[PDB]
Structure formats: structure tokens, C-alpha cells
């Protein structure tokens, strides 16, 4: 995994495009990947 650079990313099947940065927001223990009000992905947890 490479962050801070515009890369093609895919985690378990999300298969999106974007640059990944370390995020302040905290997930729930079970919740895997977040989303925004516009149904666009905004935060993902690395499975590893």
C-alpha cells in the first residue's frame, strides 16, 4: 500500500481510484468502510 500519492486502490472489492491519507475519524469495531451523504466512499480500513 502506498499513501499520499494518487494511486489505483482496491480493498476487498471496493476497486476505486484516489489518493489515501491517514484519517482522524474512528470506525466502529465491526464497521469496515465508511461513506458520505452522497453515497461516495470517503474512508476505508485496511483489512491487513
Amino acid at each position: 500500500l502506498v499513501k499520499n500519492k494518487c494511486v489505483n486502490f482496491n480493498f476487498n472489492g471496493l476497486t476505486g481510484t484516489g489518493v489515501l491519507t491517514e484519517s482522524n475519524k474512528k470506525f466502529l469495531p465491526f464497521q469496515q468502510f465508511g461513506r458520505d451523504i452522497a453515497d461516495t466512499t470517503d474512508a476505508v480500513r485496511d483489512p491487513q
Binding site: 458520505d36 452522497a38 461516495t40 470517503d42
Partner: peptide, 22 residues
């Protein structure tokens, strides 16, 4: 008074400080 899928927003030519100055 109170992400990108191709669409974008452009900043106004007169920013809020310049509009306040006007």
C-alpha cells in the same frame, strides 16, 4: 447560513473579504 464525480465549483472572482470591502 450553512466528493467530486466530475463536477467542480469555481471560486467567486470577488472573495468574501473583497465583497466585504465593497
Amino acid at each position: 447560513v450553512t466528493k467530486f464525480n466530475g463536477l467542480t465549483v469555481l471560486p467567486p472572482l470577488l472573495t468574501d473579504e473583497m465583497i466585504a470591502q465593497y
